[PDB]
């Protein structure tokens, strides 16, 4: 059996070899968006990694922690489904939400907008915004779309 | 009075011009370290921002949220105090803790280690580790000092 | 006296040793702004360098050529005056224009908006937009200010 | 219909999602070469975009502005034709020119040199030099080829 | 025939076009490792380039020079064989060395450790450590593995 | 006293915290230059470190290994003295060599050229080229100077 200090080194190095210990985080942008829009905000990489998060409604989170790697992500199905949206999809509600996010069966009154994140004309991730009561308008789409473009510039 | 959309744009742009809306996070590394050392782990930039966090003992957290900017940080006092430590300070306990972390009245019954984070021989931050019951030993310090070294490689 | 090839090599290398002989250009963004706002657009570094330019009204250009590099720039007075402006100045018209841009003598019926370009809370340049006939509104400011912010992210 | 502000935002974002709205200008280098060679100098990406320009003879420019982006470029013909040259071609004069540059109809007395720009063993671009009266010699080629090689270094 | 200056310019440029005339080196890390492990240390890219080297025992080096690129490297068979090793291989000694390194016939008394270098869960290279007399222990492995991991962070 | 594993980790980390363990080598450019010019070539940072080396005449190397690190450098006297040269110094020979390189007493028949390496208006290092029998001519200087400028661009 490897010595304890070598086993622990190996666990740290697996974490490193996977990620660089270091992740880019758009939590500050997601929070500002969340505040202005009173919304759950997810900044999701194309591979499904949650790079930024703000929860207005903590009970409604679709974030899952990878049991093995501890990395915050969307499910495999959620990850794939958002990539099928190639232009902004606004005000998804109520049963139509299940076409894209099948596990939303208590949350179908919500308005959800999905914004592709593109950098150098490539699909790099997705911005997901969702709230109760009030549909998003075009002013909200301005903010959402330029924020997504900014993420794209920072991940590119 | 500015239109609602211009007011919200200006909020987003304050977040962006400040941070971008981006940050480097060391939560995965802090989690692995916290796991293998059974410790509270804080990766704290030179200016006090908490870039990586793991809480083994959640009630003992010394993180505060900035009112105005929203960021996780140490207090000015804590921020300045950890910069006075220029080499690894291991197993700070019980009343000596108060020199560095004065708000520790109830937890002088812990072992706390402070490790400078250096990159290109410049002080970029500080790694703080704290736990109950067992003092840190030299194997623990190997893990902690190489981890701090890695953080410094990734901020630099 | 050095051979002609060596003299010419030396001149080229002076250019390379200074700059590379490379700069960053925002002409693509300045063109897109200029199109959507029907304006003359200048992206000006803090030191006075015109990094992006679009002319809707070619006759009204304030661009001058640096004697010793042919680099496009603002005059020293224009350069220093725009740095004194620390927030968006919208719809500068007609004679107040002269407080900032003193050589605007047959162009005072123009509307000019001046947007600081900030990155990481630092002043890195300025965006200047000018057009005839129609004042800028708050929607125009949204576009101007988020474009200025993007420049700040790309220079930073 | 999307609101005006949203449509303009979307135009700005297409520019950014594309290019960012940023380029890298070899105008400085082109100018230095243009000066020492008394030449029109074109630094042209593999895809035809004019990244640097100096005009000793302004009437003779082959630059066109893209109808949409307004980006300076060579025609599709000129762009594809320069990629047919895999080694330096010096002193193209006046009937061999029609094979590569067909719309040089009155400029057949000119001496034109085409130098591939190579970097990390890929063809990244082409440097085009042209002047009247004086053929280019091997000293000129030294200057031109190292300059092309440095562009190759700075795109790569 | 090209003038001599041109021909020599073209040789230099072929090196600059290829590599720049630059590599990333890990000699300083290899030297620190070789000192605290009294070992020959090889930092080897997956393609076989020797990026870092320290020789405690100069006569035993396996480094060869590529005739064309000039780069230090391992032989094709050494290169391919270390890539088959997917976990740390500790204390290769005796005849078994020959399964991995077939040219070690005068040197079978040595102990060799082979550590994969991984970066973002991809195989980027290999760390090779070798010495006489003393087997490597677990503390040696800690140092070797975290050093390998840091190479991976720096090549990634 | 700290455990052996901790003391060795601390040595490794001093190397890392310092440089990364990483550095940039100009060995490939130095080899290309020492081949075209049949010369010893040293690419030397402003602080004296040998970044690139080629030896046509191995016995005449002025490289020393740092007593502690073993890092390759010039002596402090050589390091100081090259920075007193602000323009190319060509064909330093025979007793004058000693004003700059005082330890050259068996090597006074050589021709040595010293080229400042400049990048973004700063003195970054020095290129030193040395050979028996033939003085350097202006063509040699072209190659040296442009190669120095390229090192400048790559360190900068
Ligand atoms: C990603 C699906 C939705 C938006 C999420 N469950 C929420 O309501 O926040
Ligand atoms: C930062 C001071 C100490 C470490 C902290 N309160 C803890 O026990 O986690
Ligand atoms: C810089 C001053 C103004 C904006 C400029 N002359 C123009 O009208 O385009
Ligand atoms: C690109 C073709 C030639 C070179 C160009 N029209 C010139 O004379 O400048
Ligand atoms: C790569 C094989 C071994 C390790 C090498 N010959 C040495 O003894 O250093
Ligand atoms: C740096 C001094 C001289 C150049 C060196 N000893 C050589 O002959 O290579």
Author numbering:
A (entry chain D), B (entry chain E), C (entry chain C), D (entry chain B), E (entry chain F), F (entry chain A): 1 to 156
Recite the paper's sentences.
CodY is found in nearly all low G+C Gram-positive bacteria and is activated by binding of one of the branched-chain amino acids (BCAAs; isoleucine, leucine, valine) and, in most species, GTP. The global regulator, CodY, is also a strong repressor of the tcdR gene, as well as an inhibitor of sporulation. The cGMP-specific phosphodiesterases- adenylyl cyclases-FhlA (GAF) domain of B. subtilis CodY (BsCodY) protein, formed by the N-terminal 155 residues, includes a loop of amino acid residues that interact with BCAAs; such binding induces a change in protein structure leading to increased affinity for CodY-binding sites.
The crystal structure of the GAF domain of CdCodY bound to isoleucine was solved by molecular replacement and refined against data extending to 1.7 Å resolution, as described in Supplementary Materials and Methods and S1 Table. The N-terminal α1 helix protrudes strikingly away from the rest of the GAF domain in CdCodY. Although they differ in sequence, the tertiary structure of the CdCodY GAF domain is similar to that of the GAF domain of BsCodY; 120 Cα atoms can be superposed with a root mean squared positional displacement (rmsΔ) of 1.5 Å. In both CdCodY and BsCodY, the effector isoleucine is bound in a pocket on the face of the β-sheet that is distal to the long helices α2 and α5, but the positions and modes of isoleucine binding are quite different. The first of the carboxylate oxygens of isoleucine forms an ion-pairing interaction with the ε-NH3+ of K110 and a charge-dipole interaction with the side chain hydroxyl of S130, with the second carboxylate oxygen forming charge-dipole hydrogen bonds with the phenolic hydroxyl of Y42 and the side chain amide–NH2 of N40.
